[PDB]
Amino acid sequence: EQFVASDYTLLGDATDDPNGMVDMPAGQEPATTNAVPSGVEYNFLAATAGYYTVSFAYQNTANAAAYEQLSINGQNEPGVVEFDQTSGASTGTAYASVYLKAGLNSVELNNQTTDETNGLTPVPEDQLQASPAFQIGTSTVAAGASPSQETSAQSLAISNQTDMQAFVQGESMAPKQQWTFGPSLSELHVGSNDELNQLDFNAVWFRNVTPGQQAETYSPYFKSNESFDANGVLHVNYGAYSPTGQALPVQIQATYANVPNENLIVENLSLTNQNASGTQPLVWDVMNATGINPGEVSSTTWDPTHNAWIVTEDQGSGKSPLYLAIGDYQVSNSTHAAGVDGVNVRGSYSLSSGASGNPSLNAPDQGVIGGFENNGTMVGSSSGASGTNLAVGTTDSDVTLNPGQTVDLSYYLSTATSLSQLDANLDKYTNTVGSTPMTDATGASAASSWTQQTATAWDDTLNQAYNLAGSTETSGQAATAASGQTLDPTSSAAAQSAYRSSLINILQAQSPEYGSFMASTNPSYEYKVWVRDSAATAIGLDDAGLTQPADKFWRWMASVEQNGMNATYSGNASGTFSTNYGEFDQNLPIGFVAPENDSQGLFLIGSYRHYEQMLSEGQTQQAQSFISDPTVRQALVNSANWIQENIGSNGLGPADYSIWEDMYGYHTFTQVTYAEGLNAASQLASAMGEGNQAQTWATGAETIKDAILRPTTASTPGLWNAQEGHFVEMINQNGTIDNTIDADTNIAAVFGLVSPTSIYATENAQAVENALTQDNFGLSRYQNETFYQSSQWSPGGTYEAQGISPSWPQMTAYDSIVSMDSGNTTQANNDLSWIEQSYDNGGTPPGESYDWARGQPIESTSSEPVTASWYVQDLLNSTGQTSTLMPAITGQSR
Amino acid sequence: EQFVASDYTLLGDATDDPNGMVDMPAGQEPATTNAVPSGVEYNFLAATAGYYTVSFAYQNTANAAAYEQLSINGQNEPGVVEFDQTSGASTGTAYASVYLKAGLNSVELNNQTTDETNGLTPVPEDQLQASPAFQIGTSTVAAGASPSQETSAQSLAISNQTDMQAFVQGESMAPKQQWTFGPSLSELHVGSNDELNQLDFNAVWFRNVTPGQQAETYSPYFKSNESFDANGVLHVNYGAYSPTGQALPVQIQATYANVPNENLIVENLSLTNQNASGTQPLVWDVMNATGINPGEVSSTTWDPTHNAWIVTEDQGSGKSPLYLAIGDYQVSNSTHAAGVDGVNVRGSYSLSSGASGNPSLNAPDQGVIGGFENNGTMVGSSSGASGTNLAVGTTDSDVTLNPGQTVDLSYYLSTATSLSQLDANLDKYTNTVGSTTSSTPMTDATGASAASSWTQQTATAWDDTLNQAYNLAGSTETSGQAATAASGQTLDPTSSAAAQSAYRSSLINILQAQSPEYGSFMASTNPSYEYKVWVRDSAATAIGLDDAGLTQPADKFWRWMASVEQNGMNATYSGNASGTFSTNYGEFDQNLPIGFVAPENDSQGLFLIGSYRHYEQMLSEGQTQQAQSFISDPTVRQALVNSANWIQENIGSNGLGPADYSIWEDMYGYHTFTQVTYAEGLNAASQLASAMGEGNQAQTWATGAETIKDAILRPTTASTPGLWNAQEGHFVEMINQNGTIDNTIDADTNIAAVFGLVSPTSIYATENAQAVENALTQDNFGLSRYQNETFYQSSQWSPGGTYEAQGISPSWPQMTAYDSIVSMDSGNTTQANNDLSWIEQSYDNGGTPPGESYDWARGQPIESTSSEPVTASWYVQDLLNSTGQTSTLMPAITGQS
Ligand SMILES: C[C@H]1O[C@H](O[C@H]2[C@H](O)[C@@H](O)[C@@H](O[C@H]3[C@H](O)[C@@H](O)[C@@H](O)O[C@@H]3CO)O[C@@H]2CO)[C@H](O)[C@@H](O)[C@@H]1N[C@H]1C=C(CO)[C@@H](O)[C@H](O)[C@H]1O
Ligand SMILES: C[C@H]1O[C@H](O[C@H]2[C@H](O)[C@@H](O)[C@@H](O[C@H]3[C@H](O)[C@@H](O)[C@@H](O)O[C@@H]3CO)O[C@@H]2CO)[C@H](O)[C@@H](O)[C@@H]1N[C@H]1C=C(CO)[C@@H](O)[C@H](O)[C@H]1O
């Protein structure tokens, strides 16, 4: 439904504008005598309760963001709606996802931004007070949740599925990041030497040289968002120039295309003059500049044929050098320079200083970048250069930007282990896909063709995945009901976007060499592999029918299992895993919290489900290949024997730190993975040539199950509080009960260790919903828990989440799964809508957490593949395309 | 269910105490690195969703209140739980009413007091940071809502039902009150000269003179609560001495008994040493001191027979003086002094200064009070004194207070128009009830018994009055009228203890706020609203009394309202023509119109509706002579007919009556609320037509009622707009002066369904009810008047000062009551009962009906207009409607008969 300006009730100093829009006044409503909110209100009739997206068309030509409080039914929504500076004469759209009641809902936008959680404002108070006067037009209310507008992922990886990962990062990746620089392509990891970051940065500078205007270089100090399209191409949308607070009158968009089964990254910059029709055309110079890893002694010569710098970069002791081409698809207006930066790009401007002034005006006229920042002329050699701190650049000059007419400028990166291979690459990548000196025409077409090939290649990969039942997806595998299930199609556009975004994001975060997943695409978690996260990630890919990349992961996990050579206790014996591994090595264990004994079970569960999934898709050769692989078979058997042998006299396996990694004891979560691990082992027994062990493992699975379900008040305590109707966190080392309600205890019902309709499942689910809910359907891990809030361990800095016990989409996912399975589809669908609005700008799966105080996903660990997986498991479970359930544990082998 | 200390999960620096209780740490959780909440948590299984009372046994031996954030299911409840200083070795109980979900609920108390609404903390930040270390014991979760613990009424009236009203007031009656002094009996209005406040104050000073301790006078600068018991006796419970922040080791309680059909006010002070058994007994001196109205030239002589100061107080030009006796029921150890205060009792200590020090230590050794404050010896004459600024006092000395042994000290007030009548009064009131006239000297024995007997007679007399009211169906009330269903209805009994307390408290509070001379109700018992009579409030109040079967005090009101109707002799427009009422009248005059917001045209209709319901109620109770007397009284009959003719004649071209300011008094236009009163007014007139000797007018008025009803229900999009938004499914606030629609959703539009102008099951009723619930709900079942409304918050008009309510659009129990009535009538009893529970926790400390508003940000009723009889009435209408003992519905408007 559409609400035009004339449908609004005006409040306070909100006035009608002669131009038909509404004038919103500057500033925050003070707590003074007769103070009233200024803004707009209207009423919307909701046919059914649930999530709707509320949008406002607006203009903001000031050099600061405006903030308004969204209020539904007189209740201030978490956080404030941000109205960012709009380019030239363009109209922006601000939007929020809100839970509406059935029937009439009041929708109000006002300057009452004065509420606090935990003594904090959702954005700094000084920015709420500096909120400038701006204009709003039409409001829209549409059915369905939308991703967070205000919070974007600020670090994402692009993979070629073979040997090359690049990271594209905004100017700030976490609140606590003191340095500012971006957006940029800042990391490059290639198979030949995967640990090494080949680059310092590859980034784009813009210079206005419009006749009659003050010439000025805009360096990479922009607010930005970034997200994948449906076809695996990464989009970066530029906002305000942070140092001046200006929306430049040109809209800047960049796409990065890492071409699968090639060695090419295409960068496409779209420049659109957003000034009114008939205004003086703008003229811009654009520099694409690359700093090589400063420590690596490197040399470069110009290649005039391919219009590229050819770099030889040393790789350290005893390793062959890497050869890189950094090219410019524009020829006629292109100049080139090699030498030094001439500036510290990460020491020129800090976001903390606000609109402190364009740092380009302070740059000395030295180096490739200093020169361009200073007067638009790169300083250095047009032939070549050599040393540490090597920099190269290409400038495209006198680019005419007419009102409303998009101009594309493209650049490229290729790597090879030999100059001869790089030259062959360059002949390929400076021409169209099918297809000597490159022209403006052949360059433009090459960039287009290879960008399109990226899209085609990712489409062919994602066509191995199931179509979402009821969606407009047709090119994938036929939507099929899983065992036990009935198809339950969804027409939800939000579900289709999130499903697609989730799959592409999981695959782009997978090591192309090794098959291990980055737990987070943000360096806050050091790109480390958590074996739990990756296992749970692969379970999701299998559910989605993506058995190939899943298979690559399961075989990797088998290969890195600890064989017990250096065993000192059960936690690192045969059949166990390191909590962490490196993302850029075949097998580099990294010391972290230990023991975590959930990985054994999840390995068995996921491998079992992977085997069965391949059989379900008729991939019988691939299934037989997997289960008969000596490494997989031995790894699975060792893990099974570990759980079986380490069952104690109380029927529980060893104490651990488990999923939250924060307390030692007999955790319900890990105990469930033990029981279901042995269940999985029993199921696989015959196929692993271990038929005689099937009954032992089935008995083991029942023994641990019976221990979990045993009352806490029994003579030998179990993990079930019968008095309160919920699982406990854990039994402590000394036999006392940690009675804390933990949303992760829904894992019992998720795997079907208890039936989802059992008293155990329904009572536990109700306890968790009752005690751990924030923002309607956000579930906390447990109460009085400060990770992302006060905790020093908070990866993005303290109070990134302001509300204690932040909401975790993974926990909301468990609730949705258990709710769906027990016939409560209302709760299941509300949960899915909630997870969809926990996603970041442009539909990127978020990190671990969501600040229920601010209505914002956490930036610092966006994006987290395991979160994407749990959404996919949740959604496909709700359409009956998967069942998260394992076979019932009975103590009988099949 | 009970949760002992050992059932708690301890958080942060909360520790087990060797003594079996839990040590809660000092201070507020800061916003610093690794900061964690300190406190306790446990889980409670609720069989059914709804309101429960959560209690904590505790001790606080510091000289500051402790505050904790109550958190249910990880959601901070509105405001903070206050843990006040505990006397000696006593154990206190802190409690909150909370909505629980079906199944498991987490109950947590912690120091995370850092949340803000509208940039404000629910108590001053410095007090949250100063929250001292204290100990908690057992927690209790009990089914049902309880009144607000933290907020008390701070001004209540006691009536003798004939000719005397006294006001008993705490040290502060509103946040904006800059002066501090109380508790006291501060106002006294007698029938002979009702406008005049006879007193400055009558108050009690306490002096510790315990051997071996530093002697010190505690003046009336105490935190206190006050509420009526079931029998119309007013209780004042003393808290901390504000100037030192100390809970004195003696628990002080005062009862005030204004004896009906007499001229006596008894003050009973209960002193209970709360120190441990076997500790040194304490010794106290107690002064009861009275300042006369300072402006009135007065004289006093001592009466040693009755042990009282006899005051002659001038009344102004052309009026005979009033005679007062201020007496001491203690004769042994009594001294007496007359003269001047010697101090400004309202300029000695301010609450704003915090624990600034005992102001008694700064008092000069001058005057009755200065002297007692200074060294325990009143300064003045033991014979008499004369002038302006007259003060008198009696001190009772060497009162021994043993651990746990309550000692009663009693004082008295009597007034008369002649010294001869005062002497007769004094013989009566210094002896036990039904004593033969004795003018012999009062002794310690006769005094103690007199105080007791006259206090008991107050209880008996109010019991006889309230026994004319219906027993609440399903309650333990038996001494009242038999619980009866209203015609066509079935009894729906309630075993709710909360309902019984609130019902009883509501009735006694309404009657204690009625003018004994005139029958008009004070809109508020708090001077913020100048004790003015709002004719709407009083009409709606009387409707509630009639529902409760209290037809006598209702009848006294309806006859008064008839008598003060404007006859139109000086009419300048429709708003003050024949059949209209002044928005305000004086509470201390027969007929003193007071200029306020005008016109308000809702009073005409409410007069007709309430008079109709009053007539029918008397018939229902077999009071046929009283019914016939009422409807045939020339004043009542003419007043009703004039109001009916006013509504009929003033129906405009759109079928709506004249524009007005209506119930909220804040906007001019064609308000749905007032239009409903027009339509139902004519309905009432039609019903009464034959009994008023106006049978020929019955059909005209019935047609009028239908005409206005049809206009209300006419769509806003019709060529001539009505008040029904068909697109959005709700009534609009009003049509504006210029014919535009004010589309604002207003909870008062539920009045249509309350009176049955639309059936409660109609699409109109259910859609409007849903719109109001959806848009105007705070704190689960609190309903705002309308959105973006700053009365009690930012508004300069806020009677208790700005931001008394921190949350914009405060919750109004009257609006929650309408929702409960409409919900019950449409079969949604869950919503109806949740609403009743919500109103019950909107009541003030000790079960006093609140004022108009409740701050949904702080979980506290507003102090500044506590208590408001109309709020009490709407709860009574709501409750009796839910038990089927009344129906708020009028006969269906059809246009027939
Ligand atoms: C990522 C992780 O962050 C937090 O973990 C911290 C631990 O709780 C601390 O106790 C501390 O562990 C250190 C030991 O104290 C020290 O003695 C030594 O053994 O080194 C340990 C590692 O530093 O420091 C940890 C932070 O580094 C937080 O408590 C925990 O919940 C977080 N875990 C989540 C993250 C991921 C990765 O995506 C998931 O795999 C988990 O399931 C999440 O729970
Ligand atoms: C008690 C009443 O207080 C508030 O009313 C204020 C009005 O909103 C203002 O308009 C202003 O009225 C003045 C006029 O502006 C002026 O032209 C002249 O007519 O004098 C008027 C007298 O001051 O000031 C008013 C306060 O003085 C508030 O808006 C309103 O809602 C309040 N009414 C409630 C109080 C009672 C008393 O129990 C009930 O009868 C009503 O139902 C409540 O609505």
Numbering used by the authors:
A (entry chain BBB): 7 to 441, 446 to 904
B (entry chain AAA): 7 to 903
The authors write:
Bacterial exopolysaccharide, dextran, primarily composed of α-(1→6)-linked d-glucosyl residues, is synthesized from α-(1→4)-glucan dextrin or sucrose through successive anomer-retaining transglucosylation reactions by dextran dextrinase (DDase) or dextransucrase, respectively. The DDase comprises 1284 residues, with its N-terminal 902 residues being functionally essential. DDase catalyzes primarily three d-glucosyl transfer reactions: α-(1→4)-transglucosylation for MOSs resulting in their disproportionation, and α-(1→6)-transglucosylation for MOSs and isomaltooligosaccharides (IMOs).
Therefore, the DDase minimal active form was determined to be Δ382C (Met1–Ser902), composed of domains N1, N2, and A. The wild-type and the active mutant Δ255C enzymes produced almost equal amounts of megalosaccharide (DP 10–200) and polysaccharide (DP > 100–200) from MOS, which were fractionated from the reaction products via a two-step precipitation with 40% and 90% (v/v) methanol. Finally, the acarbose-bound Δ382C crystal structure was determined at a higher resolution, 2.5 Å. The crystal structure contains four molecules (Mol A–D) in an asymmetric unit. A loop region, Thr442–Ser445, was disordered in Mol B, C, and D. Proteins, Interfaces, Structure and Assemblies (PISA) proposed that the four molecules in the asymmetric unit form two dimers (Mol A&B and C&D). Acarbose spans subsites −1 to +3 in the pocket-shaped active site formed solely by domain A. The valienamine unit of acarbose occupied subsite −1 at the bottom of the pocket, and the 6-deoxy-d-glucose and the two d-glucose units at the reducing-end side bound to the rim of the active pocket, forming subsites +1, +2, and +3. Glu858 is positioned on the β-anomer face side of the valienamine ring. Catalytic domain A is also in contact with domain N1 of the other protomer in the dimeric state at the domain A α9→α10 loop (Thr783–Trp818) and the domain N1 β4→β5 loop (Met30–Ser44) via hydrogen bonds.
